[PDB]
Short mmCIF file of C-alpha atoms and ligand atoms in Angstrom, two decimals:
data_model
loop_
_atom_site.label_atom_id
_atom_site.label_comp_id
_atom_site.label_asym_id
_atom_site.label_seq_id
_atom_site.Cartn_x
_atom_site.Cartn_y
_atom_site.Cartn_z
CA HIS A 1 0.31 0.27 0.15
CA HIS A 2 3.17 1.10 1.70
CA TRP A 3 4.31 -0.96 -1.08
CA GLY A 4 7.33 0.02 -2.47
CA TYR A 5 11.62 -0.45 -3.63
CA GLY A 6 12.96 -1.06 0.41
CA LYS A 7 13.48 -3.63 2.57
CA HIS A 8 10.27 -3.92 4.46
CA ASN A 9 7.91 -3.06 1.89
CA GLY A 10 10.34 -4.02 -1.65
CA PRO A 11 9.56 -6.66 -4.45
CA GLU A 12 10.05 -9.82 -1.60
CA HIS A 13 6.97 -8.49 0.28
CA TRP A 14 5.12 -7.60 -2.59
CA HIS A 15 2.84 -10.75 -2.51
CA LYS A 16 1.81 -10.29 1.28
CA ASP A 17 -1.01 -7.81 -0.09
CA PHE A 18 -0.87 -9.17 -3.95
CA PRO A 19 -0.90 -13.11 -3.99
CA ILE A 20 -0.31 -12.95 -7.36
CA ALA A 21 3.13 -10.80 -7.78
CA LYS A 22 3.98 -15.72 -7.57
CA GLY A 23 1.56 -15.80 -10.13
CA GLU A 24 1.68 -17.49 -13.92
CA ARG A 25 2.51 -14.74 -16.12
CA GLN A 26 4.54 -12.03 -14.10
CA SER A 27 6.62 -9.12 -15.57
CA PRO A 28 9.75 -8.38 -15.95
CA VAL A 29 11.20 -10.91 -17.24
CA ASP A 30 14.83 -11.37 -18.66
CA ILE A 31 14.70 -11.66 -22.58
CA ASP A 32 16.97 -14.42 -23.77
CA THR A 33 18.27 -13.82 -27.22
CA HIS A 34 19.02 -17.27 -28.50
CA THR A 35 16.09 -18.87 -26.85
CA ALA A 36 13.51 -15.41 -28.30
CA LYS A 37 11.60 -16.86 -31.39
CA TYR A 38 10.97 -15.20 -34.51
CA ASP A 39 7.55 -15.26 -35.68
CA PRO A 40 6.54 -14.39 -38.92
CA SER A 41 2.85 -14.13 -37.42
CA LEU A 42 3.53 -10.67 -36.29
CA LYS A 43 2.49 -7.80 -38.29
CA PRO A 44 3.98 -4.67 -38.45
CA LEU A 45 3.98 -2.85 -35.85
CA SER A 46 2.58 0.78 -35.80
CA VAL A 47 3.44 3.59 -33.39
CA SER A 48 1.17 6.54 -33.96
CA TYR A 49 1.06 9.07 -31.56
CA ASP A 50 0.99 12.95 -34.15
CA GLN A 51 -1.71 13.04 -32.36
CA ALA A 52 -0.95 13.07 -29.12
CA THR A 53 -1.72 15.26 -26.08
CA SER A 54 0.30 15.56 -23.15
CA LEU A 55 -1.60 17.12 -20.05
CA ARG A 56 0.44 16.72 -16.90
CA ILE A 57 3.42 15.72 -14.85
CA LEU A 58 2.76 14.01 -12.03
CA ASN A 59 5.09 12.48 -8.62
CA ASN A 60 3.82 9.34 -7.54
CA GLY A 61 5.58 8.51 -4.96
CA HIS A 62 7.20 5.87 -6.84
CA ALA A 63 8.24 6.91 -10.22
CA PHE A 64 6.88 10.27 -12.05
CA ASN A 65 4.37 9.76 -14.59
CA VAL A 66 3.51 12.16 -17.79
CA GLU A 67 -0.19 11.71 -18.83
CA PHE A 68 -2.48 12.22 -21.95
CA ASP A 69 -6.16 13.63 -22.82
CA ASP A 70 -7.34 9.31 -23.82
CA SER A 71 -10.66 11.39 -24.51
CA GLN A 72 -10.44 9.98 -28.48
CA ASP A 73 -8.28 8.10 -30.33
CA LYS A 74 -5.49 10.12 -30.67
CA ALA A 75 -2.31 8.60 -30.04
CA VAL A 76 -2.36 4.48 -30.67
CA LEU A 77 -0.32 1.48 -30.67
CA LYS A 78 -1.37 -0.84 -33.41
CA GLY A 79 -0.29 -4.04 -35.43
CA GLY A 80 2.75 -6.26 -33.83
CA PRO A 81 0.75 -8.82 -31.65
CA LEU A 82 -1.68 -6.92 -31.21
CA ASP A 83 -5.56 -7.43 -32.22
CA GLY A 84 -7.16 -3.74 -31.86
CA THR A 85 -5.80 -0.23 -30.79
CA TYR A 86 -4.25 0.49 -27.88
CA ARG A 87 -4.33 3.97 -26.94
CA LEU A 88 -1.56 5.71 -24.69
CA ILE A 89 -2.56 6.59 -21.66
CA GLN A 90 1.16 7.89 -19.69
CA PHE A 91 4.95 7.11 -19.77
CA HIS A 92 7.18 6.67 -17.29
CA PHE A 93 10.40 5.51 -15.99
CA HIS A 94 12.47 3.03 -14.64
CA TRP A 95 15.93 3.55 -13.40
CA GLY A 96 19.24 2.76 -10.62
CA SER A 97 21.35 4.60 -8.27
CA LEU A 98 24.15 3.68 -10.18
CA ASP A 99 24.36 3.48 -14.34
CA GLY A 100 25.00 -0.55 -14.23
CA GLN A 101 21.03 -0.76 -13.40
CA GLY A 102 17.66 -0.07 -13.28
CA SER A 103 15.96 -1.34 -16.26
CA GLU A 104 13.37 -4.46 -15.26
CA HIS A 105 13.64 -5.88 -18.03
CA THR A 106 17.07 -7.75 -18.87
CA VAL A 107 18.39 -9.04 -22.12
CA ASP A 108 21.19 -12.13 -22.00
CA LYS A 109 20.88 -11.50 -18.07
CA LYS A 110 22.09 -7.26 -18.96
CA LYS A 111 20.70 -4.67 -17.54
CA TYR A 112 20.72 -1.06 -18.61
CA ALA A 113 20.55 2.40 -16.70
CA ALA A 114 17.00 2.69 -16.88
CA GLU A 115 13.69 2.05 -18.44
CA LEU A 116 10.99 3.90 -20.06
CA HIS A 117 6.86 1.70 -20.18
CA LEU A 118 4.10 3.69 -22.22
CA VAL A 119 1.35 2.08 -21.72
CA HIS A 120 -2.08 2.01 -23.50
CA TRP A 121 -5.49 0.25 -22.73
CA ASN A 122 -8.08 -1.64 -25.31
CA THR A 123 -10.01 0.48 -27.27
CA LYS A 124 -12.91 -2.40 -26.81
CA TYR A 125 -13.41 -2.32 -23.16
CA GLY A 126 -14.29 1.65 -23.29
CA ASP A 127 -12.01 2.70 -20.21
CA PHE A 128 -8.48 2.17 -18.46
CA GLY A 129 -10.49 0.41 -15.74
CA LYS A 130 -12.45 -2.18 -17.53
CA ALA A 131 -9.61 -3.24 -19.55
CA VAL A 132 -7.36 -3.86 -16.53
CA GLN A 133 -10.17 -6.50 -15.81
CA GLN A 134 -9.06 -8.07 -19.28
CA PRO A 135 -6.15 -10.87 -20.13
CA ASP A 136 -5.59 -8.54 -22.80
CA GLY A 137 -6.14 -5.23 -21.70
CA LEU A 138 -2.55 -3.32 -21.67
CA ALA A 139 -0.40 -2.89 -24.06
CA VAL A 140 3.07 -1.67 -22.54
CA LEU A 141 5.93 -0.22 -25.28
CA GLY A 142 9.27 -0.74 -23.41
CA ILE A 143 12.23 0.87 -24.71
CA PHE A 144 16.12 0.50 -22.83
CA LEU A 145 18.06 3.45 -21.81
CA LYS A 146 22.08 3.64 -22.29
CA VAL A 147 23.82 6.35 -20.76
CA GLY A 148 26.13 8.18 -23.84
CA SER A 149 24.87 10.84 -25.93
CA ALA A 150 21.99 13.01 -24.53
CA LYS A 151 18.78 12.97 -25.67
CA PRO A 152 17.33 15.98 -26.90
CA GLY A 153 13.44 14.68 -26.72
CA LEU A 154 13.73 14.02 -22.67
CA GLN A 155 15.71 17.69 -22.09
CA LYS A 156 11.89 19.28 -21.77
CA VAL A 157 10.83 15.87 -18.81
CA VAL A 158 14.41 16.58 -16.97
CA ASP A 159 13.88 20.32 -16.68
CA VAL A 160 10.11 20.02 -15.35
CA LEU A 161 11.28 17.99 -12.73
CA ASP A 162 12.84 20.39 -10.26
CA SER A 163 9.06 21.26 -9.87
CA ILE A 164 8.04 17.45 -9.10
CA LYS A 165 10.14 16.64 -6.79
CA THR A 166 7.78 15.83 -4.32
CA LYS A 167 5.46 12.83 -3.49
CA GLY A 168 2.29 14.16 -4.51
CA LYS A 169 3.44 17.32 -6.67
CA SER A 170 2.26 17.26 -10.21
CA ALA A 171 2.85 20.32 -12.81
CA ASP A 172 1.77 21.04 -16.82
CA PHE A 173 2.97 19.41 -19.44
CA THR A 174 0.90 19.49 -21.91
CA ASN A 175 2.36 19.12 -25.63
CA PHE A 176 5.19 17.18 -25.82
CA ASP A 177 5.65 14.71 -28.47
CA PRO A 178 6.47 11.31 -27.50
CA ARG A 179 8.32 10.38 -30.53
CA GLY A 180 11.34 12.19 -29.75
CA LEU A 181 11.68 9.48 -26.87
CA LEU A 182 11.28 6.22 -29.92
CA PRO A 183 15.11 4.60 -30.92
CA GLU A 184 15.54 4.21 -35.28
CA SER A 185 14.30 0.70 -35.45
CA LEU A 186 10.77 -1.06 -33.78
CA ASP A 187 12.54 -3.94 -33.90
CA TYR A 188 11.31 -5.47 -30.76
CA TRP A 189 10.54 -8.69 -28.66
CA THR A 190 6.80 -9.33 -27.25
CA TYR A 191 5.30 -11.79 -25.14
CA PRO A 192 2.63 -11.88 -22.45
CA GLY A 193 2.57 -10.22 -19.21
CA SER A 194 1.81 -8.23 -16.03
CA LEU A 195 2.05 -4.86 -14.44
CA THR A 196 5.76 -5.00 -12.95
CA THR A 197 3.85 -2.03 -10.09
CA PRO A 198 1.95 -3.43 -7.77
CA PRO A 199 -1.49 -4.79 -7.80
CA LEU A 200 0.42 -6.34 -10.30
CA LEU A 201 -2.38 -7.09 -12.48
CA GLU A 202 -2.10 -10.04 -15.91
CA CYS A 203 -3.46 -7.73 -18.78
CA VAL A 204 0.01 -6.78 -20.28
CA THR A 205 0.44 -7.46 -24.05
CA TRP A 206 4.59 -6.25 -23.31
CA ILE A 207 6.76 -5.76 -26.29
CA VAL A 208 10.31 -4.54 -25.42
CA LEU A 209 12.38 -2.30 -28.59
CA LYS A 210 15.42 -4.27 -28.55
CA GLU A 211 17.63 -0.77 -30.13
CA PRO A 212 18.25 1.46 -26.60
CA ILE A 213 17.90 4.97 -26.57
CA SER A 214 20.82 6.68 -25.57
CA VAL A 215 20.67 9.72 -22.89
CA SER A 216 23.44 11.75 -20.95
CA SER A 217 24.66 11.60 -17.45
CA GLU A 218 23.82 14.97 -16.55
CA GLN A 219 20.03 13.89 -17.64
CA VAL A 220 19.77 10.54 -15.76
CA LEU A 221 21.37 12.76 -12.94
CA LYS A 222 17.90 14.44 -12.95
CA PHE A 223 15.66 11.74 -12.65
CA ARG A 224 17.94 10.62 -9.25
CA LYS A 225 17.06 13.54 -7.77
CA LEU A 226 13.87 12.91 -7.06
CA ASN A 227 12.27 11.97 -3.74
CA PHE A 228 9.70 8.94 -2.77
CA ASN A 229 8.89 11.61 -0.31
CA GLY A 230 6.56 14.04 0.14
CA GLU A 231 7.51 17.51 0.68
CA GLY A 232 8.05 18.20 4.32
CA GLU A 233 9.50 14.70 5.23
CA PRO A 234 13.07 13.50 5.66
CA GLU A 235 14.63 13.12 1.82
CA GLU A 236 14.88 9.12 0.39
CA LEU A 237 16.22 9.43 -3.76
CA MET A 238 13.76 8.40 -5.72
CA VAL A 239 16.15 5.29 -7.27
CA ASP A 240 16.50 1.87 -7.97
CA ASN A 241 12.58 2.00 -8.35
CA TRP A 242 12.99 -1.61 -10.47
CA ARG A 243 11.26 -4.61 -10.17
CA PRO A 244 13.89 -7.39 -11.31
CA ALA A 245 13.29 -10.42 -13.59
CA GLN A 246 10.52 -13.01 -13.02
CA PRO A 247 9.97 -16.83 -13.60
CA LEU A 248 9.06 -16.76 -17.45
CA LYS A 249 6.83 -20.22 -16.19
CA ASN A 250 4.82 -21.35 -19.52
CA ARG A 251 5.65 -17.87 -21.59
CA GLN A 252 7.50 -18.11 -24.92
CA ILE A 253 9.50 -14.28 -26.11
CA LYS A 254 9.02 -14.13 -29.72
CA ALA A 255 11.00 -11.98 -31.96
CA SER A 256 10.14 -9.55 -34.67
CA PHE A 257 13.32 -9.70 -36.68
CA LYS A 258 14.84 -12.03 -38.00
N1 25X B 1 6.38 -0.28 -14.94
S1 25X B 1 4.49 -0.69 -14.87
O1 25X B 1 3.68 0.33 -16.39
O2 25X B 1 3.73 -1.89 -15.10
N2 25X B 1 3.18 -0.59 -14.04
C1 25X B 1 2.32 1.35 -13.43
C2 25X B 1 1.50 1.47 -13.69
B1 25X B 1 1.07 3.18 -13.04
B2 25X B 1 -0.72 3.35 -11.64
B3 25X B 1 -1.66 2.58 -13.59
B4 25X B 1 -0.41 3.77 -13.59
B5 25X B 1 -0.81 2.50 -14.95
B6 25X B 1 -1.78 1.57 -13.52
B7 25X B 1 -1.05 1.61 -12.55
B8 25X B 1 0.83 1.89 -11.91
B9 25X B 1 0.11 0.46 -12.66
C3 25X B 1 0.28 1.51 -15.02
B10 25X B 1 0.83 2.37 -14.28
ZN1 ZN B 2 7.26 0.29 -15.59
#
């Protein structure tokens, strides 16, 4: 509730309040690249973000969410493994205290410095709340971050973080274009899984891009200045807000590329 990323409330404890934490399709997972199989049945992936309308950025005490107006069919994900149309509702990141950790998914056990999640809901279910009662309710586009060159399209996010340092703070964040966070290639891996935060609901088709984006050390250092705590409370830096890899169980990871 109550849940977080610490010793007494972190991922090892979540199962007590959220028993699905030990479920059959939990996320993240390690992506074993040798075992993932090219799937010719996957259709072309379509990321259509031209009309995306951002509203606000919020520090929710675990991460920050950039929120979108999803009241009309605008920013949508379709194709690939997906049947129908999934509407963008928000994005957020997971990141580490050091550049050698921070991602939730891993690639041949490699951890990236951070991971971006663009969260979408299946428009056949009418609203996000109904979508998370369905096994195909959500699609999350996951993008790895490595530290090197700056990502210019990220800088507007970085520069607003000073205004949402603590839990419960929000700021207007209109006219942000999420196209500036996408790598060149849409090559991906896909598998059925879950939300990686409580309530850990098993509603997600994961689409994890193979090509990371590069961000600068200065950009990620600013993520690490955020706080888990609220205003006036003792400072706990918002770092290491990632769940580690979970058992693959009865799943196969499919690749979009040969
Ligand atoms: N890492 S994740 O995208 O699986 N889960 C993060 C969340 B935050 B809150 B709503 B929002 B949407 B749902 B709950 B929490 B869960 C998705 B966003
Ligand atoms: Zn996430």
